[model samples]
Target chain A: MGASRLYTLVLVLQPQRVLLGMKKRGFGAGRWNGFGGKVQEGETIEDGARRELQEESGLTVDALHKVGQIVFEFVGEPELMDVHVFCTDSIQGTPVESDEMRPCWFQLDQIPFKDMWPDDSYWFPLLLQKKKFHGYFKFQGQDTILDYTLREVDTV
Target chain B: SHMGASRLYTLVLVLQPQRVLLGMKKRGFGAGRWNGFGGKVQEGETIEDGARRELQEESGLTVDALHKVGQIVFEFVGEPELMDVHVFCTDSIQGTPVESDEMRPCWFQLDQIPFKDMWPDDSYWFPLLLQKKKFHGYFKFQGQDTILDYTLREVDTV
Candidate 1:
């Protein structure tokens, strides 16, 4: 099977806090996670990351640096989620609730990992550390990680 | 509009002094063309891990060093699934070459890649890999051999 599409996931970082979103609808609804979604056809990955961040959180990111990538495979499915993970510290405006997501900020020590994607815990640390990483996750469903692998690298 | 989730594929090219190894697919997707060794990234394996595994399984070689060279997103008209193919290359490896049921391994001179017998997009990015340059490309294909629209360029990193 071929890839269905490309997606983006960007995390906004502060000295001790990280910005996240609680999905109001669509995939990953009811979970607190980073801000990002599909990469539209005409934009570069970086552009998509910034646009999605703004659309979902009302925070316009000034710059986004590539920090990691993850490919998610779901059992009995023909499609794979190729997510280009990014991070940024420069953004404008306040986090406002959108029709798609509810914005939230959490202290690094208090991130609600239990309410995020199961694979988040595996690669979140690397992103927080500003490390470039690559990862793969296979899920039996939305809640169970069937298998996975991750690594921090000097470059992507 | 976004159709749905995509499929991920990886391809690894092993380079020696003046030759690169490519495999002719014995079956499945791209079944009759010469291409780099790779397949679907299985569960529990990183993209690199999956690339290495495919190389070993298809050519009986274990990578001593592998580096990420490029990434491409392949889009086809009227087809919902895109092929997000990650490309890698290596100069060091272990083991003797042996063919498997899935591929027939062969080495070609750097100047002699079988472009006509491979995916249409290969000619766009293969030279960058040979020059050790990182790149990213987006290709819109009308069919297996016709590219409708495309963008390619060299990059500092992936």
Candidate 2:
């Protein structure tokens, strides 16, 4: 079934590091994995990634790898559409926080899975492995994974 | 962005510091444009090597270097979303660019691209490549009439 639409970006660094948007909400919000939002009117996936990355990280990426694309649909609730995953080994500027994201760099092994959605652990490994993959995961509750599947999508 | 069967073909060719050349299909989109000699991304093959295959088939060149800049997504009249386009650039190759029945490799000056005959959006982002600017775009169009309703952005966080 179809519902609402959303998009997310995975801004990354190499050698076990990825930039995380710092959380503005004080007492608790951990950090954001990358930079992205819903697809705007007539915006291309590449444009969206570029826009979000600029707003969130405030740096320029020399080259981008459009590694994979994903579709997340649940029986009920909004349909998280066409999620595009991009990766870059290095970027131009020093990372900083914005009104929306408080930027921070995290080691690949130190991802806060407890704070991240439950499904992340399942597929995130593939990202770390540098294996281009496409898949969908259903979440019944906040931390409960209802179902999931993956296909070995290759890199460009 | 229905590619019908999701045809993934890889091609490789040649390049120099000032000019980029590619073979063109006799009557295909960018028919006269000097585009890269590559095909759709085939299953079980990396887009890098796939590109090499395309070059090898066209003129027997081996890719020695590859720099993936970005991808272009085209939204046709009635597609559900956008046809996924994966684009790349390579600086080092083993041989030269040649001519084929389907591909007549032509070189164009960085400032002079035959855009009117190619996709209208090419004019917006193609220059970035030569300037070494990392950019990506989503284009919406009918033949050559470009609809800016289609948006584009520089993906660099700077």
- Scored on chain A only, each candidate's TM-score is 0.95, 0.83
**B31 Cα displacement, candidate 2 (Å):** 55
Interface RMSD of each: 13.0, 14.3
The worst-scoring run of ten residues by lDDT in candidate 2 chain B lies at B1-10
Error of 1 at B121 (Å): 32
Query: Residue A20 deviation, candidate 2, in Å?
Result: 1.7
Report how far residue B118 has shifted in candidate 2, in Å.
47
Q: Candidate 2: global Cα-lDDT?
A: 0.63
Q: What is the lDDT of residue A16 in candidate 1?
A: 90
Which residue ranges in model 2 land beyond 4 Å of their true spot?
A: A1-6, A25-31, B1-158
Query: What are the RMSDs of all candidates, in order?
Result: 12.5, 13.7
The numbered model that scores best in lDDT is: 1
The CA lDDT at A38 in model 1 is 91
Clashing pairs in 1: A3-B6, A3-B7, A3-B82, A4-B5, A4-B6, A4-B7, A5-B6
Cα displacement (angstroms), candidate 2, residue B109, comes to 51
